[PDB]
Write a protein that binds this ligand. Structure first.
Ligand SMILES: Nc1ncnc2c1ncn2[C@@H]1O[C@H](COP(=O)(O)OP(=O)(O)O)[C@@H](O)[C@H]1O
Ligand SMILES: Nc1ncnc2c1ncn2[C@@H]1O[C@H](COP(=O)(O)OP(=O)(O)O)[C@@H](O)[C@H]1O
Ligand SMILES: Nc1ncnc2c1ncn2[C@@H]1O[C@H](COP(=O)(O)OP(=O)(O)O)[C@@H](O)[C@H]1O
Ligand SMILES: [Mg+2]
Ligand SMILES: [Mg+2]
Ligand SMILES: [Mg+2]
Lengths: 533, 526, 159, 527
């Protein structure tokens, strides 16, 4: 009478390291608690007043940022429910590019209120049904909350104003300058054709002179040097070769068979003459810059130097295609001279020196092209990485604007209006789903509450003021950050707007993650064993 | 430091203790499978060291999965394997008999009788047992299919397949009959090589059947091949239909520009020549034990020929036997005789989620495939074991058409005859003779025990019944525990199985009786 | 879909019918000097595989059965087993190096696999470990009735 | 202790009633775990593997495989369920439940000193009677679209959420009707299942064509072709080394250049044949040319093909040869020795979709595609896996419904009717096998019991209501999972595959009979 044996049946047959969680209080509440913990550990980095977090991964690499997706990626999350919510956040990042913190906060609040509903007596199925109905109602309501539209994407000032809000949460202190840079870079890209490619915006990080000295370049910058002695070309005629700058050889086996002395004494001379002829044929087509994807032979380099040809060696083939796209050339497979149509033209190619880094710059004087490079300066690698993440957020916001031009007010105004409307709708519906609908509406309060908490003011007073104003009839009113007391102001007048499509996708993904977590009733975890990766 | 004659790990024991240990180990081996005999036997679950599960009630299948340290038990297991391989039936009976004779020999070894006298008495009793069995046997007309089916049924009433008895009996009889071959004045059955049993989990057991041909788990090499041919002409090959290196080192030396292209064109032309040699015989199906090149596939398909590659050698031999073909290595030596005509249908159909190739309408085939479809893998393995037992019994009857009454009737009759013979020796070896004669009653005893009836009353009644004149066929009903004549119940066994059981049991007893010393621990020294 | 290895199932089926007489067991080394004088002894041209294990650790019995099947199929190789504690391994070996595949050839190591659970699994089959060993070319390249082998006087005739 | 332990001291043996107790306990544990899976109202289980992969499932087979159990009887039940899923594709949870309840009911009588042999005899007699009843109760109906829709819903609602179940039902029924040929067995290899990870679960649909997981490997390839000629080939368009160890021998740089130029004449000739065919079939820019190759294409041939406006794909799946020949209507070629326009398929639209680092190629607007594809779209990997398993189950159910000429009412109605018939037939069976027949009937009654329990009602009251209604009216009445009152399953549209029911009966009876007869679990392969 000193030990409790394992119950007969499944309990005994379970493996030594396996874990079995079943029922409501042993599985659902534990999953909800884990998701709440994840939401709590990410909450403080929300909004313009969000705080960066120093995250060190298992490889001792240091990340400092307030991007929720990056923070979740760099955290070794082990709980399966938190893993699912992180997957939802990553899907939101992939689909849109901004709103990951919103997804996580909304999912956490939804699961918290779901636990509360389950405690008061509601069932899992009824909670899920109410959440789905309320999500459908929110998706129906959302288009009516649209304030204005982009109505122009070729204007630098309009695009900068639109993109300021997206990169205002990150790098709150200096967002106008970054907005102008990203606007110029995006407007250079995005030609008359409606398609916009995010990959066409390149970012180069050069250390030394602070982020305020960053600049946008209509072209490409490579952190390399020139093989030859020519280091500056003013009327470049780039010829791009996917083959090494060397005489091509066979593929089975190359064996030189010598049977007479004359062949032995003439082989090297003939090879040199052939290489000289090939290089001179390349040069006679007006080419003065040659970019190769392979190695550069000594003889080829010498003969290129003789004819004043600038040699650049790009090892990575992604950079090769990017250069072909930005200059307007074709990567030749052989060392033949390039035909007129295959010749790439860049207005100026030169070897420069920024900070202490040797770079080769393909520069276009025209304010257009296919690929634009943002040269990021700074005084720390981590700071430059954070600025690059902000630039990525801005570019993704521009891409979303190209996809859909509708905008909704930010600063929690959209969330508060959605909460009010869904709460009003929930009164009409009878049955047990009204509680779930009201809880779904109340889960929208976590966004203005998080903003108020991060801004340093009382969240309850801000929420009450927002409800009072929205009940009056002003549906475009959010909290004012630049205030020491709880205050609200019009978001439309202040220009604090976020994309409608991003909010739509974020709400959908958060609701799906919450209901998917709720549907789980039993957990059968295998023994962890090993598997570091 | 120490000096020894033998090695340190060499352990030796001898005397009455060794004989007692050997006999105890044999009795333990017998007791392991004692309850797995008779129509009312219960199955056993065996866990393989590899993780597999064997669920059966066969003596050899149970015993081959047991690892033992006592060499007497190893001898008994080898005896079980010998009985299984020689005749295919009577595996539990021989083990039980060996245990009983060793027990009744231990009884005499406790006294002052030398083991050699017991062995001589055992050999004399074995000779008399053979004589009595040959005397009480009856002939069988192999032409009568009903009698053969009844024999197979009596053979498989004690296995898990007995619930589907007519189907299993017909399958075994048909397979054995159609695998029978007679070439160059030599008669062979060859159940081991041909008549392959292919089991596919799923379906119902009643859907199982024996095919008039061979089924293999292969699919056509290309989608545009025909998956259904009415009367195909089949050609079987060994060599690959692809360009391959020679044996000698044959490096080339290319100096002209066109030599590389010429080499490639010659490779393609060689493939085309091989395919043309195949096509010249105008076949419909080509089967190869090795790979077939894609270009070879195209050239064959241009002539509307279905090709299957990478078939096992055993499967190819079975196909050749079934469809009357001849395997040809070099395609240029193909003749009209080598082409296999006789297959009445070829079909590649889908079973579950896998493709299977059927050649299942052959006329006069010498090979077959038994298609087992059951609940799971273990059930199908047990069904395959039972079918193997049935086919072995059928082959034994076909080779020797002598028949012997079953259910312990033959053993009780032999015991009574041997006792009557012993009533006249008047020597000193008569006691072991009579003891080993009466030791045959263990199998009627265990039949009664498994039936659950009273052992003593039934055994006494049977022994009294066998003392009459014409009562050699009186045995025990295995599922009701009553004394019934076996010319009414119909349970009969082949004479070969009984002869092998008695010979093997008596010789095992002799072998383990001839031993009184055990030395162990020495290295193999090799 | 060539990764599914359809031949693996037929190879396992053929391995199930490996031998008739017995499954045989992996030799258990009882001492260190026994280990030394069996690795040093025997022909150097044969591959000797040594199995390192301790009782109770998971991931062992599966590879015991795998080596049993390999010894059944392969008569040349000399699969053997020995307790980890008997040799006297250190604490790190006894805590994170239980699965150890010691391969001997020519009197020296040619295969030194340890911590093979990630690359093999926990309940892997014989074919899986066979393929794993074949990945490095570690595997060297009828059924008699029972036996055949029975001075040097052979035969003559009349002369 | 026993004989084996005497012979092998390090052996584990369970003997006589011990074996029965162990087997029945294992079966009861498996049944207790898998009870909550049955029915659309069943709970969803989450499985985490050793590496940390998350899987959401409701299948009996999937749950069994990823359930950390190392039991012999559980292994036998898992093998039976695996065979059931392999052949029929449905009924795994019902299989496990029926086996467990058969063993429990048999134990109920065995614990009273009764021999298992009589129970097995009763089981086999009841199995024969139940098979006869199933033959006499099946609904032989014409498999029109509505019946297939009903069956597909009956499966997918049990597998996934209601709206996703409806979407998958439409997709599965449409795909099966698309690939089906009259009086010809349905080949399920012709329905390619592709997974995308960018949209919601409800965005999955059916493409009347083919979707490929690889795209063009040349940046200058056309990203969209309207009218496409499809060339399905299995010819290597990359450089191939000679089999007989050729090697090159030259004496000057000019000779080396000549040899380099002349070593590609074979592949250049094949590409020239392709280009000549393309120029012959389409002399304008209206019709595009698409080449799908099972083997790789080197950059030189890729550039040569792209210069002619030809989009080319390489390293295609082996089954894609048959899929494209059946969908586009062309002829798969293993060599360009004699190629004509009659070997070219047609595709009314070919475009490429880019998703992350993966490039997908779409082939729509075919004339009468005999092979279609199912695009699985979801925000999560586990969602994709669950939808794929549900689609497999639904496809198997629809194929079974098409194959058999009949369909059996579900919702536990057929099991209740079988139990009633077995109870009626019990007096006919002689001997003490009547107890086995009664145990078989009670075991068959597990399905409505578990359905009612999962729906939230009480087993006994609901079961007696169903039985009383069936006895009074004679209609095949089953459990209504929303109200609990009996409903005519045929009228509502709750259909079960007849082959699934027959396989369930056969396999469950066989495995229960074989397990009940085991009297010794043994493990002596060591030492
Ligand atoms: N100047 C501002 N004043 C008030 N609220 C702001 C301001 N700028 C941004 N926000 C709010 O911050 C939110 C953006 O939070 P953010 O940190 O970008 O999360 P995520 O990266 O997940 O989108 C928006 O919903 C917006 O309403
Ligand atoms: N219906 C029956 N009634 C009585 N005895 C039977 C019956 N059927 C078979 N037997 C006996 O059972 C024995 C077969 O048992 P079995 O399980 O095959 O053991 P073994 O494999 O050693 O022959 C035969 O010797 C036969 O005499
Ligand atoms: N909408 C429904 N109403 C009533 N009964 C249903 C409904 N859908 C399914 N069922 C019944 O519930 C059972 C579901 O079994 P299922 O979970 O598919 O087990 P398995 O996966 O082993 O086939 C079926 O036998 C069916 O008769
Ligand atoms: Mg943001
Ligand atoms: Mg027998
Ligand atoms: Mg189902």
């Amino acid at each position: 009478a000193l030990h409790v044996p394992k119950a007969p049946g499944f309990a005994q047959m379970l493996k030594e390291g396996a874990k079995h969680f079943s029922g409501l209080e042993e599985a659902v509440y534990r999953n909800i608690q884990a998701c709440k913990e994840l939401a709590q550990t990410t909450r403080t980095a929300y909004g313009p007043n969000g705080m960066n977090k120093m995250v060190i991964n298992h490889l001792e690499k240091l990340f400092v940022t307030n991007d929720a997706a990056t923070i979740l990626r760099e955290l070794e999350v082990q709980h399966p429910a938190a893993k699912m919510i992180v997957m939802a956040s990553h899907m939101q990042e992939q689909e849109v590019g901004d709103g990951t913190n919103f997804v996580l906060v909304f999912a956490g609040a939804l699961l918290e209120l779901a636990e509360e509903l389950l405690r008061i007596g509601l069932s899992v199925s009824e909670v899920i049904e109410g959440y789905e109905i309320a999500c459908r109602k929110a998706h129906e309501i959302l288009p009516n909350l649209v304030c204005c539209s982009a109505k122009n994407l070729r204007d630098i000032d309009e695009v900068s104003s639109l993109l300021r809000t997206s990169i205002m949460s990150k790098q709150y202190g200096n967002e106008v300058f970054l907005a102008k840079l990203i606007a110029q870079a995006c407007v250079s890209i995005f030609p008359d054709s409606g398609h916009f490619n995010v990959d066409n915006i390149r970012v180069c990080k050069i250390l030394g002179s602070g982020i305020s000295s960053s600049s946008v370049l209509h072209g490409m910058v490579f952190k390399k040097e020139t093989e030859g002695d020519v280091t500056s070309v003013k009327d470049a005629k780039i010829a791009v070769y996917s083959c090494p700058f060397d005489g091509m050889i066979t593929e089975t086996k190359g064996t030189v068979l010598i049977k007479t002395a004359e062949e032995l004494m003439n082989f090297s001379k003939g090879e040199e003459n052939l290489m000289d002829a090939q290089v001179k044929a390349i040069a006679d087509t007006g080419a003065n810059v040659v970019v190769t994807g392979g190695k550069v032979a000594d003889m080829a380099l010498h003969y290129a130097n003789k004819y004043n040809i600038m040699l650049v060696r790009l090892n990575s083939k992604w950079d090769l295609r990017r250069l072909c796209k930005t200059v307007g050339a074709t990567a030749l497979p052989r060392l033949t001279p390039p035909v007129l149509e295959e010749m790439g033209h860049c207005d100026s190619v030169y070897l420069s020196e920024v900070g202490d880094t040797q770079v080769v710059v393909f520069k276009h004087e025209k304010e257009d092209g296919a690929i634009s490079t943002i040269v990021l300066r700074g005084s720390t690698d981590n700071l430059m990485d954070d600025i690059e993440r902000a630039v990525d957020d801005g570019v993704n916001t521009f891409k979303v604007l190209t996809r859909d031009k509708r905008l909704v007010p930010g600063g929690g105004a959209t969330e508060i209006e959605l909460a009010k409307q869904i709460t009003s709708y929930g009164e009409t519906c009878p049955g047990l789903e009204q509680y779930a609908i009201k809880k779904f509406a109340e889960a929208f309060e976590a966004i203005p509450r998080a903003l108020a908490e991060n801004s340093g003011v009382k969240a309850n007073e801000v929420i009450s003021k927002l409800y009072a104003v929205h009940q009056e009839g002003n549906k475009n009113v959010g909290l004012d950050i630049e205030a020491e007391v709880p205050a609200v102001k019009d978001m439309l007048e202040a220009g604090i707007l976020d994309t409608y499509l991003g909010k739509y996708w974020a709400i959908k993904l958060a609701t799906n993650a919450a209901v998917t977590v709720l549907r789980v009733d039993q957990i059968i975890m295998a023994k962890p064993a090993g598997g570091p990766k | 430091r120490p000096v020894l004659v033998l090695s340190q790990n060499t352990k030796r024991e001898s005397g009455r203790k060794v004989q007692s240990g050997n006999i105890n180990a044999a009795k333990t081996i017998a007791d392991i499978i004692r309850t797995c005999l008779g129509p009312k036997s219960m199955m056993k679950m065996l866990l393989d060291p590899m993780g597999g599960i064997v669920m059966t009630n066969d003596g050899n299948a149970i015993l081959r999965e047991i690892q033992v340290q006592h060499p007497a038990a190893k001898s008994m297991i080898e005896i079980s394997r010998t009985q299984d391989e020689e005749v295919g039936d009577g595996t539990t009976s021989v083990i039980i008999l060996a245990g009983e004779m060793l027990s009744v020999a231990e009884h005499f070894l406790e006294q002052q009788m030398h083991p050699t006298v017991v062995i001589s008495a055992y050999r004399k009793a074995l000779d008399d047992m053979i004589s009595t069995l040959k005397k009480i046997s009856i002939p069988v007309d192999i032409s009568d299919s009903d009698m053969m089916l009844n024999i197979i049924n009596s053979s498989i009433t004690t296995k898990a397949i007995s619930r589907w008895s007519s189907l299993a009996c017909n399958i075994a009889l048909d397979a054995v009959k159609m695998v029978q071959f007679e070439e160059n004045g030599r008669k062979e059955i060859d159940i081991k090589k041909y008549a392959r049993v292919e089991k596919i989990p799923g379906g119902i057991i009643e859907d199982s059947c024996v095919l008039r041909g061979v089924m293999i788990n292969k699919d056509v090499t290309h989608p545009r091949m025909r998956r259904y041919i009415k009367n195909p002409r089949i050609v079987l090959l060994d060599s690959s239909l692809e360009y391959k290196k020679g044996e000698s080192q044959t490096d080339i030396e290319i100096t002209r520009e066109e030599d590389f292209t010429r080499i490639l064109q010659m490779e393609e032309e060689y493939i085309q020549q091989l395919c043309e040699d195949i096509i010249q015989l105008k076949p419909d199906v080509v089967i190869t034990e090795k790979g077939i090149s894609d270009l070879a596939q195209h050239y064959l398909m241009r002539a509307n020929i279905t090709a299957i590659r990478r078939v096992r050698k055993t499967d190819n031999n079975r196909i050749a036997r079934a469809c009357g073909a001849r395997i040809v290595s070099r395609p240029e030596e193909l003749r009209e005789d080598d082409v296999g005509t006789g297959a009445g249908l070829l079909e590649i159909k889908k079973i579950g989620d896998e493709y299977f190739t059927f050649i299942t309408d052959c006329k006069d085939p010498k090979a077959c495939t038994i298609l087992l479809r059951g609940a799971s893998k273990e059930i199908l393995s047990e069904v395959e074991r039972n079918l193997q037992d049935a086919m072995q019994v059928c082959r034994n009857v076909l080779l020797d058409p002598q028949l012997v009454p079953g259910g312990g009737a033959s053993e009780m009759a032999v015991a009574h005859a041997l006792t009557e013979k012993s009533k006249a020796m008047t020597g000193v070896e008569q006691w072991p003779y009579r003891a080993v004669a009466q030791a045959l009653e263990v199998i009627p005893r265990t039949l009664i025990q498994n039936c659950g009836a009273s052992t003593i009353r039934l055994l006494t009644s049977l022994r009294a019944k066998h003392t009459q004149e014409n009562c050699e066929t009186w045995g025990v009903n295995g599922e009701t525990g009553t004394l019934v004549d076996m010319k009414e119940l119909g349970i009969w066994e082949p004479l070969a199985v009984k002869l092998q059981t008695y010979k093997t049991a008596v010789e095992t007893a002799v072998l383990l009786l001839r031993i009184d010393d055990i030395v162990s621990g020495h290295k193999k020294k090799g | 879909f060539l990764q599914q290895y359809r031949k693996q199932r037929m190879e396992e089926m053929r391995q199930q019918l490996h031998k008739g007489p017995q499954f045989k067991q992996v030799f258990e080394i009882s001492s260190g000097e026994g280990f030394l004088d069996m690795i040093d002894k025997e022909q150097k041209s044969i591959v000797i595989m040594v199995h390192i294990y301790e009782d109770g650790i998971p991931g062992t019995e599966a590879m015991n059965g795998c080596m049993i099947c390999l010894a059944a199929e392969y008569p040349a190789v000399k699969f053997c087993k020995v307790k980890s504690s008997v040799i006297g391994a250190s604490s790190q070996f006894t805590r994170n190096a239980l699965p150890a595949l010691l391969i001997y050839k020519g009197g020296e190591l040619i295969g030194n696999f340890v911590r093979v659970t990630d690359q093999l699994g926990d309940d892997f089959f014989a074919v899986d470990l066979e393929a794993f060993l074949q990945e490095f070319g570690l595997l060297p390249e009828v059924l008699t009735s029972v036996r055949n082998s029975a001075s040097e006087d052979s035969d003559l005739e009349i002369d | 202790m026993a004989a084996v332990k005497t012979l092998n001291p390090k052996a584990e043996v369970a003997r006589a009633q011990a074996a029965l107790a162990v087997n029945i306990s294992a079966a009861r544990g498996l049944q207790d775990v898998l009870r909550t899976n049955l029915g659309p109202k069943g709970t969803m289980k989450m499985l985490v593997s050793g590496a940390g992969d998350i899987k959401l499932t409701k299948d009996g087979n999937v749950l069994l495989h990823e359930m950390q159990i190392q039991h012999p009887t559980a292994s036998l039940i898992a093998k039976v369920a695996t065979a059931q899923d392999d052949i029929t594709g449905d009924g795994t949870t019902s299989n496990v439940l029926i086996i467990g309840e058969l063993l429990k009911q048999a134990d109920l009588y065995i614990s009273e000193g009764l021999h298992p042999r009589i129970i097995t005899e009763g089981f086999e007699a009841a199995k024969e009677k139940a098979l006869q009843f199933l033959e006499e109760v099946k609904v032989s109906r014409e498999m029109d679209r509505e019946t297939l829709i009903d069956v597909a819903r009956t499966s997918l609602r049990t597998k996934v959420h209601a709206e996703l179940a409806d979407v998958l039902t439409e997709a599965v029924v449409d795909s099966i009707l698309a690939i089906k040929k009259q009086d010809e067995p349905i080949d399920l290899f012709m329905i390619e299942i592709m997974e995308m990870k960018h949209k919601s679960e409800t965005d999955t649909s059916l493409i009347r064509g083919l979707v490929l997981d690889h795209g063009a490997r040349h940046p200058d390839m056309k990203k969209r072709v309207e009218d496409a000629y499809i060339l399905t080939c299995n010819v290597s368009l990359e450089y191939e080394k000679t089999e007989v160890n050729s090697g090159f021998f030259y004496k000057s740089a000019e000779e080396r250049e000549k040899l380099v130029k002349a070593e590609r004449k074979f592949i250049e000739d094949r590409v020239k044949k392709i280009i000549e065919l393309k120029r012959k079939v389409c002399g304008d820019s209206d019709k595009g040319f698409v080449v799908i190759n099972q083997k790789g294409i080197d950059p030189f041939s890729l550039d040569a093909l792209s210069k002619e406006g030809i989009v080319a794909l390489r390293r295609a799946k082996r089954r894609n040869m048959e899929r494209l020949t059946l969908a586009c209507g062309g002829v798969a070629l293993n060599s360009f020795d004699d190629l004509s326009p009659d070997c070219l398929g047609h595709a009314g639209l070919v475009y490429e979709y880019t998703l992350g680092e993966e490039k997908f190629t779409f082939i729509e607007k075919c004339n009468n595609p005999r092979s279609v594809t199912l695009l699985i779209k979801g925000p999560n990997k586990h969602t994709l896996t669950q939808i794929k398993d549900a689609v497999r189950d639904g496809l198997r159910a629809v194929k079974n419904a098409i194959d058999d000429g009949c369909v059996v009412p579900g919702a536990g109605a057929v099991e209740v009717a079988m139990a009633e018939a077995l109870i009626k037939h019990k007096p006919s069976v002689k001997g003490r096998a009547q107890l086995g027949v009664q145990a078989f009937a009670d075991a068959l009654l597990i399905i409505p019991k578990v359905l009612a329990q999962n729906s939230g009602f009480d087993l006994q009251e609901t079961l007696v209501k169903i039985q009383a209604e069936h006895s009074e009216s004679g209609q095949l009445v089953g459990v209504d999972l929303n109200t609990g009152e009996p409903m005519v399953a045929a009228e509502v549209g709750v259909w079960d595959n007849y082959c699934v029911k027959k396989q369930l009966l056969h396999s469950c009876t066989v495995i229960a009979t074989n397990i009940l007869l085991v009297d010794e679990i043994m493990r002596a392969g060591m030492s």
